[PDB]
Amino acid sequence: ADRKLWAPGVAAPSYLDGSLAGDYGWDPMGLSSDPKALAWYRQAELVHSRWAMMGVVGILGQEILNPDVFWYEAGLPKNLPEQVSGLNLGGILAFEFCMMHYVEVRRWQDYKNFGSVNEDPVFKGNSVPNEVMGYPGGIFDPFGFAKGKDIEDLKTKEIKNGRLAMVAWTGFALQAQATGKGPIACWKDHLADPFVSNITANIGTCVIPDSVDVGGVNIPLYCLWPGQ
Amino acid sequence: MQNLKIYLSTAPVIAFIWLSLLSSLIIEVNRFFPDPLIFAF
Amino acid sequence: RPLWLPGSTPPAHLDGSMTGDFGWDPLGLGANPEAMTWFREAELQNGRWAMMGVFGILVQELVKPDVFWYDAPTKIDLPFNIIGIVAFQAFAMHYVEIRRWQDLRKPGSVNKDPIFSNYSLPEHEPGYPGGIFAPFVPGDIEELKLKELKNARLSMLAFVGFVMQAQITGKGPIACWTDHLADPFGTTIFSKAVITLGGAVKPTCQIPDHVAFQGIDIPTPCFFEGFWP
Amino acid sequence: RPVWYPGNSPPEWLDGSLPGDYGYDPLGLASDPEMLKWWVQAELVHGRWAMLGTVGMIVPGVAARAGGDFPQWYDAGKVYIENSSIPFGALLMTQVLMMGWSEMMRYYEFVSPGSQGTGSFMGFTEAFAGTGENGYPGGRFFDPFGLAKGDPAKLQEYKVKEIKNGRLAMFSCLGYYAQYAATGKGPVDNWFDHIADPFHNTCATNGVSVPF
Ligand code: CLA
Ligand SMILES: CC(/C=C/C=C(C)/C=C/[C@@]12O[C@]1(C)C[C@@H](O)CC2(C)C)=C\C=C\C=C(C)\C=C\C=C(C)\C=C\[C@@]12O[C@]1(C)C[C@@H](O)CC2(C)C
Numbered sequence A: 001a002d003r004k005l006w007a008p009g010v011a012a013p014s015y016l017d018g019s020l021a022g023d024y025g026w027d028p029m030g031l032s033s034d035p036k037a038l039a040w041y042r043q044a045e046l047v048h049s050r051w052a053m054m055g056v057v058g059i060l061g062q063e064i065l066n067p068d069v070f071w072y073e074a075g076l077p078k079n080l081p082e083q084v085s086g087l088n089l090g091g092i093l094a095f096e097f098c099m100m101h102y103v104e105v106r107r108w109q110d111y112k113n114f115g116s117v118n119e120d121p122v123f124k125g126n127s128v129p130n131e132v133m134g135y136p137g138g139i140f141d142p143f144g145f146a147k148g149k150d151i152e153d154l155k156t157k158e159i160k161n162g163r164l165a166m167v168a169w170t171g172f173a174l175q176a177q178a179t180g181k182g183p184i185a186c187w188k189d190h191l192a193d194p195f196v197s198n199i200t201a202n203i204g205t206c207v208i209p210d211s212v213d214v215g216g217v218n219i220p221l222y223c224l225w226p227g228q
Numbered sequence B: 001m002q003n004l005k006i007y008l009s010t011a012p013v014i015a016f017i018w019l020s021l022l023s024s025l026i027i028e029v030n031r032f033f034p035d036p037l038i039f040a041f
Numbered sequence C: 001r002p003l004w005l006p007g008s009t010p011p012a013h014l015d016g017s018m019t020g021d022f023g024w025d026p027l028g029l030g031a032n033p034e035a036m037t038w039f040r041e042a043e044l045q046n047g048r049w050a051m052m053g054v055f056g057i058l059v060q061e062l063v064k065p066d067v068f069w070y071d072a073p074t075k076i077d078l079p080f081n082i083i084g085i086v087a088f089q090a091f092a093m094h095y096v097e098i099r100r101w102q103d104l105r106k107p108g109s110v111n112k113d114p115i116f117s118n119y120s121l122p123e124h125e126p127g128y129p130g131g132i133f134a135p136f137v138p139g140d141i142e143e144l145k146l147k148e149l150k151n152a153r154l155s156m157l158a159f160v161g162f163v164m165q166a167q168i169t170g171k172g173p174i175a176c177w178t179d180h181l182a183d184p185f186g187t188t189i190f191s192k193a194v195i196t197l198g199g200a201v202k203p204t205c206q207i208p209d210h211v212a213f214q215g216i217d218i219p220t221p222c223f224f225e226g227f228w229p
Numbered sequence D: 001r002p003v004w005y006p007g008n009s010p011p012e013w014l015d016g017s018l019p020g021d022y023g024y025d026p027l028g029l030a031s032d033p034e035m036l037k038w039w040v041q042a043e044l045v046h047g048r049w050a051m052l053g054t055v056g057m058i059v060p061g062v063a064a065r066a067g068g069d070f071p072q073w074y075d076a077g078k079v080y081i082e083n084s085s086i087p088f089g090a091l092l093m094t095q096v097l098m099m100g101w102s103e104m105m106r107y108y109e110f111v112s113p114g115s116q117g118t119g120s121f122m123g124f125t126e127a128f129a130g131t132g133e134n135g136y137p138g139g140r141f142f143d144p145f146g147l148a149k150g151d152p153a154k155l156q157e158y159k160v161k162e163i164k165n166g167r168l169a170m171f172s173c174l175g176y177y178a179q180y181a182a183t184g185k186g187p188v189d190n191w192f193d194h195i196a197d198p199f200h201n202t203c204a205t206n207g208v209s210v211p212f
């Protein structure tokens, strides 16, 4: 049934019912269709929503709990903590790749076919339970709720919080880019003197260096819009 | 392409094309081997 | 059945047949029954030389004296020339092999011992000569046959490591073994090169060209340095 | 079928089965059924020389970043006969001798597919016999890995890749020529020049393509 559609008068597209989680029946590009695309796009919307939700919290956690270290940088082996700083990022990235390349390929193949390998290799006596394409959690949910009680309602809260992040996190990347300020910092500026702290100012300046090199002349930074 | 060939096979076409192959050739033979009065070379 | 990719969908022409078939054909070379039989020998041949080869280098270094393997000079020295050996190498392997190669193409005709007759065996499997070649038979089953590939297919894959590692790292196989466990986050040749937009670093080959052997050039360059990371 | 310039229909004569047939004949040069099979080979040949030409241009270029002293594809002709050791005439006339043999052999299998592998060229029956399609010889020599022998459904799927990779190699190899005549520098040099300062290295800034 119509929950509430995004614009007041609109026709929900045919393929859009509201069977999925946060459906408002908004696909004006008509891009999702022939649901083999929908399944694919849904996966991205999830995966993006999740990394954003972790991202947004991780950025607030950085700046609040580490007042220095302007967030948008954080990468180069200066801001790094004491135990690190001398782990040679080229060896740090090495440690990451083989870890993510497995898990992601592990997830991708479980999109191709479905219910195919949800089971542990190695010990191979055990598996994650049934789902629909991207809701695992025998292990991935240890605490067992969102099983018997309302499930899709928690799914609904998952997207609506996720979509908020993807936009919010995007705000981070463009704010920190033009201002040169962490999220809670540029917020503090606004509350101080809004009329002159507004986006009206400090546009036309990306205020970012174009080199930012570590072990060489490396890593060109192309900003976003060509503000000088 | 069927009918474009048959037209290119008309009498005046070949008469033009094939003389312009002699004419060109006989012109360029005189470019590299100029002034040939007698066959002496 | 178990597959190289646990969720995969093995190609049509390859199902559960050959010893140790996990369903790996990006290019589909096995769809031809004649040629796949040929390729079936090569996998054993390349495997069975590499296995005996990779075990060579390792023993050649750790228990043995330590010179990572570019060496003509040895402590078995050079007992009979070189061109002496290569002379005998050709005729040796020539008989050894054009003999076995014929049991591939026209099977069974070779089983007889050429001088007298102890023969060999029935015709068996073209790439698994029984009898005198396999007296001991440690495992009793073709489980051991599948057990042979999975070793070799690793060793061949392992051998390429020895080349490339000994290209730029300029050290033997087990030298860089211990060198990694000491400060692991260094020396991945992941760290050691980048090539991002803009910046490109590559480690230079630690082995030179023109190695002097008995007054002979022997250019021996590195393997496609320009495309290294 | 996904034709080029969507919304039209293919020229009525070719809708047929050809690898990589998008219905593009805007001057209608396939209108002669006898001639079409001659163009289908013509493309296949160019597509195959393209794909070899492109790599032959890029690799010596890409090799030059690390050093290793090669020339660019242009003025690699001189550099060889600069150092010479064999005359230019002997080389170009060994071309025409050996090369002309293949082509004039490749031709009479197109004319009459039966011959060329009947025999009596040093034996070699069935290696040259040809597999029956226009530009695909198949066989022992031209096809050492025995591919295009097993599953045909996989084969027809290569024949599409070969063209589509060929049509791109041609259209790129038109770029190597044209962007040499303007910027006067190697293909990978340009691939770095535009990846370094994209803004002032673009096409309008070569001063040739956009005259004033
Ligand atoms: C929707 C329509 C629209 C459009 C098309 C634009 C377009 C533009 N706005 Mg704009 N704007 C809009 C709506 C719009 N705005 C609205 C609704 C607002 C809210 C009030 C603003 C508020 C606004 C501000 C506050 C500013 C702009 C600026 C700009 C320009 C930035 C271009 C740029 O970064 O070039 C990159 C390069 C330049 C602009 C350089 C031009 C200077 C000389 C003549 C050229 C030589 C410099 C060189 C080429 C650049 C690199 C070197 C550098 C180190 C200087 C661009 C022309 C900015 C501006 O003036 O330019 C940044 C600026 O400060 N706008
Ligand atoms: C905004 C966004 C997507 C917006 C997409 C939109 C609007 C698409 C809309 C449409 O398609 C629909 C809906 C319907 C169509 O009919 C119409 C259109 C219009 C086509 C994605 C952002 C997605 C953003 C994401 C996923 C961000 C993830 C960020 C992460 C993981 C950050 C990590 C770090 O911050 C930490 C954690 C620590 C730091 O120190 C270091 C780093 C590494 C930088």
Ligand SMILES: CC(/C=C/C=C(C)/C=C/[C@@]12O[C@]1(C)C[C@@H](O)CC2(C)C)=C\C=C\C=C(C)\C=C\C=C(C)\C=C\[C@@]12O[C@]1(C)C[C@@H](O)CC2(C)C
Binding pocket: C024, C025, C026, C027, C028, C029, C045, C046, C047, C049, C050, C051, C052, C053, C054, C056, C057, C069, C156, C157, C158, C159, C160
């Ligand atoms: C790695 C290797 C092959 C890897 C091949 C792969 C992954 C192929 C995959 C595919 O084909 C399939 C599966 C299916 C297709 O759909 C897809 C492709 C991609 C086509 C061969 C190495 C094979 C390696 C071989 C044959 C080496 C033999 C020789 C040795 C070991 C001798 C060594 C010595 O002589 C020295 C060097 C010095 C002396 O001092 C000591 C001694 C050590 C002993």
Ligand SMILES: CC(/C=C/C=C(C)/C=C/[C@@]12O[C@]1(C)C[C@@H](O)CC2(C)C)=C\C=C\C=C(C)\C=C\C=C(C)\C=C\[C@@]12O[C@]1(C)C[C@@H](O)CC2(C)C
Binding pocket: D024, D025, D026, D027, D028, D029, D046, D047, D049, D050, D052, D053, D054, D056, D057, D072, D073, D074, D076, D077, D170, D171, D173, D174
């Ligand atoms: C073969 C080819 C390139 C071959 C490259 C070679 C050999 C490499 C040579 C080199 O390595 C050497 C020798 C020496 C090196 O040191 C240097 C070089 C010189 C580089 C390009 C073909 C290049 C061919 C190209 C680009 C053709 C484009 C044609 C188009 C678009 C035609 C379209 C139409 O015909 C249709 C399709 C249908 C009609 O109805 C409509 C129209 C429009 C008529």
Ligand SMILES: CC1=CCCC(C)(C)[C@H]1/C=C/C(C)=C/C=C/C(C)=C/C=C/C=C(C)/C=C/C=C(C)/C=C/C1=C(C)CCCC1(C)C
Binding pocket: A075, A088, A089, A090, A091, A093, A173, A214, A215, A216, A218, A219, A223, A224, C191, C192, C193, C194
């Ligand atoms: C969200 C966002 C908005 C603004 C920008 C952008 C639009 C691009 C987008 C950014 C997306 C992201 C996350 C991009 C990722 C960027 C980065 C920095 C990726 C990683 C870069 C650096 C890496 C791996 C490692 C570098 C270290 C190198 C080489 C070498 C170090 C070393 C030295 C110096 C020499 C020898 C020894 C050794 C160890 C090799």
